[PDB]
């Protein structure tokens, strides 16, 4: 339930936050934040940012309280010199000794009740102000308080967004008055409760709403179905330990008067933050102004300016530069000659800084990319992956003229940089990852890959034979020759061979629907509809079409140029375009023949390297599973060791049947999957499929806890953070329909796996770029988690050292190398 | 299904929306926007990916705006400063990517940019002459279009629907059906007309007068 | 931005003939996209880049072209191939479609079914009177409809509307409506609707008296 950044302390019409679990949150995350001396400041940093985010909505005042539980030296350290003490480790109580003074300096009050827990204090102050006439809002991070949501009591946070009381009836479906019984059968972190079983794929995560009809665990009921009643009477003294969540009593003896804000002491406020090196982010209280009507200027000194350009087509390599401008101090610097203006500039700074550098490298000019507003908005919200969308949302427009577009890049920097300075996790991703990567992608598009012009023509007649054979197969059946592919003439054959049933909840009735997913469910019976869907997969390449590789070759260089977008994706990968090599059918005899066309120069060789099971390695690092890290530390196979601990057989007695069943779960865990989806891929039944997911969690305990931690930090957070700090704004994780919520959860635990795996590649490409310039090698492609280079034996060993030793992880990374003349000779 | 207004005034902002169910706008596929009619010449307006937007529209980027709402599972369209220069008749297309091609394509919807008011339709019955050939006259409406179906969509044989002609800020549409003499008038034949612009739904019977 | 032009626009062919149509650009064009659309449906795929056939597609269809002009050629025509075709490219282009080659089916010259219609009681109480005349099933599209009120020929107030070719038998249909007032209807008596076609030397006369 809600939360993302620490903070705390109620007051009428203001936030009602808690400061217990919010100190434990920022210690297990954002660990890469330290000073130049050697003082930790990874949790002390969340004070001047969170309380600032809430001050835009504002209210009256804020008070201050501490914890008083049995294990608290780390939690209640926010007032050690005041009152309160208990026992816990020595590594954290030194950091909170810096915030206790900054409390009374902003004009905030204080309160402390020793003996009673912090969770009991919030329940008392919520119901007391309701009777007086004040507006309150419960607010918390830990999954304990949500039952107190009623009239006049709302949901918000200084951390993130807003939720209503009707929004509680959406995903959950339960009422507030009975929400105390929700967490009494779930589990999650801090609460010891092991036992979910299964029965009907619901387990305990999707069963919750059925328990409302006759509780069973608390008062009445004797007999019922398994898993819904079997795990209550079996587990003794386990449910009697789960009542710590229910310990949120509203009847505690406390007076405390609600008063307004005090005078802020700004003389010492800035004195404490400078010793922490964060005394510069105090200029966030100002307002912003930006119009598209700017001034003009000629050519005198335009160093460090924001450029803008006009092209003939969206592809930089073939396009002609029609106009070029610059912006410094709110003035537009127009040019009479486009090709001459490229030599007067130091660096391409502004919108689409990568795409302009590619135009310069063709003419013979080394232009480096600097700052770009496209990458600034990408880190704050992944929905803004357009030069148009960043302008229209934040205040501005995107025209066809270069003079107005150059002046836009100056303003889109002023507004987005202010929001990025308060984010240290995104500044690391902008200085060390994004900006220097723009210099790498610019060279892969400018140089390109050489193709074998004698193979593509021969393949054009080879595949043509496979087409004519399957075309003659449908002509042999049904009798009369007709016009295929056309929806109007396909129904005429279905008139002769009657067989048209329903599909499901996926929208029907229209004319667009009779070309999307029609006949895809009918293949399980008739062979006539199978030789048209197997044909839909045999004849694709560039989906029916075949984009000519020898004709798309530049008349100047002689190589194919592929555009790599740095933003695009949601996870954090580099999506290609012209040609889109991101989605190629692998391990298939069709997609393997397309790679044979991609060769190197007359004396150069292709060195293709691929990340061997990185998506399974990252799963172990973010969880901390002692059994999953064990497989990689030794250097064994993951698909074999999983099936060993599940069935109870040794690693050598594992046959191809059990290794297959384990492979489907190891690839399914990336997006979660379900027992219904697992039953369709394998020959295993519905009731037997549930046991295969349980044996996976019995062998790997911390992995189950991680899914519960991501479901926590997702439905409540709004986004899903990675190891480095990437965002993913999705409010879909709290929906009414079963089809919208399930699709949202599938995207929750999919970004910290596929995104970090892509970020380790992004950070590797930056460190490998200086080493390629001296060795005489170059970078070419980036598909999925594979990097293709062109040099050969000396570079293969150097590239392996950079990719593996990119960041110190808990698991040992392994990369598979491959040297050859072509992409098929190198394989992975 | 294309949802939006049937009429819009000059120099204003247009708001359209194509709804989707089943396959969400977060799994895969890019959703395009392309128009057609009356000159049969088409024009592009851009797309919207699963991740966010990623669109790169044509030379006229100062007016078009593409946004979305993932919670409701639909994508909006905003065309600022809409004039008479816009050809109109918007279709919601879709790209596949990885391997590029257009396959599906939207509904249609005939929107017109004018300063005139929305008018209601008037249905008049016509008597069959020669080998029994009926008719339905719909005139005095603004703007396009009207869904005409004979016997609630049961009779489809011999149905010839004529297009609407513009005669000074007014439209006139007609239709005709041909059946046997053993049918009329032992069996009731009716003209069902429905206008989505004025919300005027009225049923009219063909009586022997 | 390049301009796409399809030569020609409207053309007809009989079942069994050899059809040919071309799509041309202004500059050096690489690769082409081909589409198809029937009256009352969404546009789909058919032929792809330069020559070969797509998922499905009959063996009678074939492509050609390289450089400036790309064409489509059909060796055997049928009654189900008549539809509208479009062309697009993605080489040196931000993607835009062509004009539209509307291919129709050719049949025998048939005579028109003309019938004159009188106005209803609901229209005369309002204040107007519209005399309609439906002409169904005929070949070709060229036809001259003349309105003669009591001897004199009327040309003003005639709303002509032509339809597209059918998919069942492939024929043309036209509608002519003469919108007049109530005061001009009660003044006159006889109204005629003629039809001059290729199939007949003399016009098809149909009139009624009040």
Q: What are phi and psi of A418, to 5 degrees?
A: -65, -35
Taking the CA of residue A471 and the nearest CA in chain C, the distance in Å comes to 6
Residue C2 shares a structural domain with residue C72: yes
CATH number for A562-613+758-827 (one of 3.40.50.300, 3.30.70.370, 3.40.50.1820, 3.40.630.30): it is 3.30.70.370
Burial of A677 (0-12, 13-18, 19+ CB in 10 A): middle
Contacts of B174 in chain C (CB under 8 A): 132, 134, 161, 175, 177
Final residue of a structural domain among C84, C107, C130? C107
Query: Coil, strand, or helix at residue A699?
Result: helix
Residue C90 shares a structural domain with residue C168: no
CA proximity to A811, closest of A669, A605, A531, A619: A619
DSSP structure class, residue B20: -
State the Cα–Cα distance between residues A811 and A620, nearest whole angstrom: 7
Residue C98: CB partners within 8 Å, gap ≥ 6? B41, B42, C4, C5, C6, C23, C86, C87, C88
E strand intervals along A138-195:
none
CATH number of A1-176+250-283: 3.40.50.1010
Intrachain domains A177-249 and A614-757 with the same fold: yes
Contacts of C169 in chain B (CB under 8 A): none
Residue C146 shares a structural domain with residue C210: yes
Q: Which residue in A483, A488, A532 is closest to C41 by CB distance?
A: A488
* Contact state of A474 with C91 under an 8 Å Cβ cutoff: no
Contacts of B135 in chain C (CB under 8 A): 117, 132, 134
* Cis amide linkage into residue A579, ω under 30° from 0: yes
CA proximity to A623, closest of A810, A816, A435: A810
Q: By the CB < 8 Å criterion, does B100 face chain A? A: yes
Experimental structure resolution, Å: 2.3
Query: Coil, strand, or helix at residue A619?
Result: helix
CATH code assigned at C55 = 2.60.40.10
Tell me which architecture the domain covering B116-208 has in CATH. Sandwich (2.60)
Which residues constitute the domain of residue C199?
108-210
| Token couple for A745 | 């959860």
Query: How is chain B split into domains, by residue range?
Result: 1-115, 116-208
Positive or negative CA dihedral for A750, A751, A753, A758? positive
CATH number for A300-446 (one of 3.30.70.20, 3.90.420.10, 3.40.50.300, 3.30.420.10): it is 3.30.420.10
Q: Which B residues, 40 through 59, put their C-beta within 8 Å of a C-beta on chain A?
A: 49-57, 59
Final residue of a structural domain among C107, C133, C160? C107
Neighbours of B63 (CB within 10 A): 18
State the Cα–Cα distance between residues A283 and A536, nearest whole angstrom: 59
* Contact state of B70 with A730 under an 8 Å Cβ cutoff: yes
DSSP structure class, residue A146: -
Residue C138 shares a structural domain with residue C52: no
Report the number of distinct structural domains present in chain C.
Answer: 2
Residue C150 shares a structural domain with residue C85: no
Reported residue count of chain A is 828
| Token couple for A304 | 């460090």
DSSP structure class, residue B102: B
CA distance between the termini of chain A: 44
DSSP labels for C44-85? EE-B-SSS-B-SS--TTEEEEE-EEEEEEEESS--TT--SEE
Neighbours of A650 (CB within 10 A): 7
Final residue of a structural domain among C107, C129, C155? C107
Neighbours of B, requiring at least 3 CB pairs below 8 Å, are A, C
Angle at A204 between CA A199 and CA A210, to 5 degrees: 80
Strand order in the sheet with C191-193: C152-154, C147-149, C191-193, C207-208
Query: Coil, strand, or helix at residue B79?
Result: strand
* Contact state of C57 with A492 under an 8 Å Cβ cutoff: no
Tell me which architecture the domain covering A614-757 has in CATH. Orthogonal Bundle (1.10)
Q: By the CB < 8 Å criterion, does B186 face chain A? A: no
Q: What are phi and psi of A663, to 5 degrees?
A: -70, -30
DSSP structure class, residue A516: T
CATH number for B1-115 (one of 3.40.50.280, 2.40.50.140, 2.60.40.10, 2.40.160.40): it is 2.60.40.10
Taking the CA of residue A221 and the nearest CA in chain B, the distance in Å comes to 39
The CA radius of gyration of chain B, in Å to the nearest whole number, is: 21
The CA radius of gyration of chain A, in Å to the nearest whole number, is: 31
Give the CA distances from residue A553 to residues A547, A575, A584, C88, in Å, rounded to whole numbers and listed in that order: 11, 21, 21, 20
Q: Are strands B12-19 and B2-3 parallel, antiparallel or unpaired?
A: antiparallel
Give the CA distances from residue A29 to residues A41, A155, A281, A603, A618, in Å, rounded to whole numbers and listed in that order: 12, 24, 21, 49, 16
* Contact state of B162 with C122 under an 8 Å Cβ cutoff: no
Using an 8 Å Cβ cutoff, are C46 and A488 in contact?
Answer: no
Query: How is chain A split into domains, by residue range?
Result: 1-176+250-283, 177-249, 300-446, 447-561, 562-613+758-827, 614-757
Positive or negative CA dihedral for A119, A120, A121, A127? positive
Q: By the CB < 8 Å criterion, does C16 face chain A? A: no
| Token couple for A460 | 């054009």
CA distance between the termini of chain B: 41
Contacts of B53 in chain A (CB under 8 A): 383-386, 388-389
CATH number for A177-249 (one of 2.30.30.40, 1.10.1370.10, 1.10.150.20, 3.30.70.420): it is 1.10.150.20
- CATH topology (fold) of A447-561: Taq DNA Polymerase; Chain T, domain 4 (1.20.1060)
State the Cα–Cα distance between residues A157 and A146, nearest whole angstrom: 13
| Token couple for A806 | 């990119």
Give the CA distances from residue A291 to residues A288, A396, A402, A411, A749, in Å, rounded to whole numbers and listed in that order: 11, 7, 16, 8, 41
Residue C94 shares a structural domain with residue C159: no
């Amino acid at each position: 339930m809600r939360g993302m950044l620490p903070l705390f302390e109620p007051k009428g019409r203001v936030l009602l936050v808690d400061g217990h679990h919010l100190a434990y949150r920022t210690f297990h995350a954002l660990k890469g934040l330290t000073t130049s001396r050697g003082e930790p400041v990874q949790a002390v940093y969340g004070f001047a940012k969170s309380l600032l985010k809430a001050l835009k909505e504002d209210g009256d005042a804020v008070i201050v309280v501490f914890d008083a539980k049995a294990p608290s030296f780390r939690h209640e350290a926010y007032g050690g010199y005041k009152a309160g003490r208990a026992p816990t480790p020595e590594d954290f109580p030194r950091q909170l000794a810096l915030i206790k003074e900054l409390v009374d300096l902003l004009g905030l009050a204080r309160l402390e009740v020793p003996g009673y827990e912090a969770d009991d204090v919030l329940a008392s102050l919520a119901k007391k102000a309701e009777k007086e006439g004040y507006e309150v809002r419960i607010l918390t991070a830990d999954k304990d308080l949500y039952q107190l949501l009623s009239d006049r009591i709302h949901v918000l946070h200084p951390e993130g967004y807003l939720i209503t009381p009707a929004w509680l009836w959406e995903k959950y479906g339960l009422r507030p008055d009975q929400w105390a019984d929700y967490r009494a059968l779930t589990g999650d972190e801090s609460d010891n409760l092991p036992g979910v079983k299964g029965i009907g794929e619901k387990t305990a995560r999707k069963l919750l709403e059925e328990w409302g009809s006759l509780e069973a665990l608390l008062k009445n009921l004797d007999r019922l179905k398994p898993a819904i009643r079997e795990k209550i009477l079996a587990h003794m003294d386990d449910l009697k330990l789960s009542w710590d969540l229910a310990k949120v009593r509203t009847d505690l003896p406390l007076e405390v008067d609600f008063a307004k804000r005090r005078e802020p002491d700004r003389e010492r406020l800035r004195a404490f933050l400078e010793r922490l090196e964060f005394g510069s982010l105090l200029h966030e209280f100002g307002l912003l102004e930006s119009p598209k009507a700017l001034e003009e200027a000629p050519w005198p000194p335009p160093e460090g300016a924001f450029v803008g350009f006009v092209l003939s087509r969206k592809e930089p390599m073939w396009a002609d530069l029609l106009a070029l401008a610059a912006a410094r101090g709110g003035r537009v610097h127009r040019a009479p000659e486009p090709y001459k203006a490229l030599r007067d500039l130091k660096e391409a700074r502004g919108l689409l800084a990568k795409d302009l550098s590619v135009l310069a490298l063709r003419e013979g000019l080394g232009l480096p990319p600097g700052d770009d507003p496209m990458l600034l908005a990408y880190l704050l919200d992944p929905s803004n992956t357009t030069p148009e969308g960043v302008a229209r949302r934040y205040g501005g427009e995107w025209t066809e003229e270069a003079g107005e577009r150059a002046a836009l890049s100056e303003r889109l920097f002023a507004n987005l940089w202010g929001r990025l300075e308060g984010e240290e996790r995104l500044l690391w991703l902008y200085r060390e990852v994004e900006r220097p990567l723009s210099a790498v992608l610019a060279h892969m598009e400018a140089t390109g890959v050489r193709l074998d012009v004698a193979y593509l023509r021969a393949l054009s007649l080879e595949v043509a034979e496979e087409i004519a054979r399957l075309e003659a197969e449908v002509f042999r059946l049904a009798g009369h020759p007709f016009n295929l592919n056309s929806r109007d003439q396909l129904e005429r054959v279905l008139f002769d061979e009657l067989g048209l049933p329903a599909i499901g909840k996926t929208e029907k009735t229209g004319k667009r629907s009779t070309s999307a997913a029609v006949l895809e469910a009918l293949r399980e019976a008739h062979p006539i509809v199978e030789k048209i869907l197997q044909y839909r997969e045999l004849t694709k390449l560039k989906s029916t079409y075949i984009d000519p590789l020898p004709d798309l070759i530049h008349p100047r260089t002689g190589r194919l140029h592929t555009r790599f977008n740095q933003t695009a994706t949601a996870t954090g990968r580099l999506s290609s375009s012209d040609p889109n090599l991101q989605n190629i059918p692998v391990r298939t005899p069709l997609g393997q023949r397309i790679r044979r066309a991609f060769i190197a120069e007359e004396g150069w060789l292709l060195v293709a390297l691929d990340y061997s099971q990185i998506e399974l390695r990252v799963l172990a690092h973010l969880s901390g599973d002692e059994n999953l890290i064990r497989v990689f530390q030794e250097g064994r196979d993951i698909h074999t060791e999983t099936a060993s601990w599940m069935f109870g057989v040794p690693r050598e007695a594992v046959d191809p049947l059990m290794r297959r069943a384990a492979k489907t779960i190891n690839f399914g865990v990336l997006y979660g999957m379900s027992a219904h989806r697992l039953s369709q891929e394998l020959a295993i039944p519905y009731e037997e499929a549930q046991a295969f997911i349980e044996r996976y969690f019995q062998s790997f305990p911390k992995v189950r806890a991680w899914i519960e931690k991501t479901l926590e930090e997702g439905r409540r957070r709004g986004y899903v953070e990675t190891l480095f700090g990437r965002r993913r704004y999705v409010p879909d994780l709290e929906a009414r329909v079963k089809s919208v919520r399930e699709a949202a959860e599938r995207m929750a635990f999919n970004m910290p796996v596929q995104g970090t795996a892509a970020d380790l590649m992004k950070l590797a490409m930056v460190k490998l770029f200086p080493r390629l310039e001296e060795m005489g090698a170059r970078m070419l492609l980036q598909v999925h988690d594979e990097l293709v280079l062109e040099a050969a034996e000396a570079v293969a060993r150097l590239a392996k050292e950079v990719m593996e030793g990119v960041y110190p992880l808990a698991v040992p990374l392994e990369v598979e190398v491959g040297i050859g003349e072509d992409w098929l000779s190198a394989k992975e | 299904q294309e949802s939006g207004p049937g009429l819009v005034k000059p120099y204003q902002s247009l708001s359209l929306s194509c709804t989707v169910t089943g396959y969400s706008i977060t799994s895969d596929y890019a959703w395009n926007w392309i128009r057609q009619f009356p000159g049969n010449k088409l024009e592009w307006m851009g797309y919207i990916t699963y991740s966010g937007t990623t669109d790169y529209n044509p030379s006229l980027k100062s007016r078009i705006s593409i946004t979305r709402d993932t919670s409701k599972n639909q994508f909006f369209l905003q065309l600022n400063s809409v004039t008479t220069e816009d050809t109109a008749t918007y279709y919601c297309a879709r790209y596949y990517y990885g391997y590029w091609y257009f396959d599906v394509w939207g509904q249609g919807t005939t929107l017109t940019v004018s300063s005139a008011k929305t008018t209601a339709p008037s249905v008049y019955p016509l008597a069959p002459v020669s080998s029994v050939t009926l008719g339905c006259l719909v005139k005095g409406y603004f703007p396009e279009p009207v869904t005409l179906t004979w016997n609630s969509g049961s009779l489809s044989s011999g149905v010839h629907t004529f297009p609407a002609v513009l005669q000074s800020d007014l439209y006139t549409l007609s239709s005709s059906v041909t059946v046997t003499s053993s049918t009329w008038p032992s069996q009731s034949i009716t003209c069902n007309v429905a206008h989505p612009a004025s919300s005027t739904k009225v049923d009219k019977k063909i009586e022997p007068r | 931005d390049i301009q796409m032009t399809q030569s020609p626009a409207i053309m007809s062919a009989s079942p069994g003939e050899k059809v040919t149509m071309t799509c041309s650009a202004s500059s050096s064009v690489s690769y082409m996209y081909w589409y198809q659309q029937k009256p009352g449906s969404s546009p789909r795929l058919l032929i792809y880049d330069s020559t070969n056939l797509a998922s499905g597609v009959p063996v009678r269809f074939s492509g050609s072209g390289s450089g400036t002009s790309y064409s489509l050629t059909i060796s055997r025509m049928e009654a189900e191939d008549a539809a509208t075709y479009y062309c697009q490219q993605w080489s040196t282009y931000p993607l835009t479609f062509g004009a539209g080659t509307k291919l129709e089916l050719k049949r025998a010259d048939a005579a028109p079914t003309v019938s004159i219609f009188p106005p209803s009681s609901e229209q005369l109480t309002s204040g107007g009177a519209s005399v309609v005349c439906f002409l169904n099933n005929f070949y070709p599209k060229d036809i001259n409809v003349k309105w003669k009120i009591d001897g004199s020929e009327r040309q003003n107030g005639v709303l002509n509307s032509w339809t597209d070719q059918d998919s069942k038998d492939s024929t043309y249909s036209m509608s002519s409506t003469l919108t007049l007032t109530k005061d001009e209807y009660e003044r006159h008596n006889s109204y005629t609707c003629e039809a001059t076609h290729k199939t007949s030397t003399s016009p098809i006369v149909k009139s009624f008296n009040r």
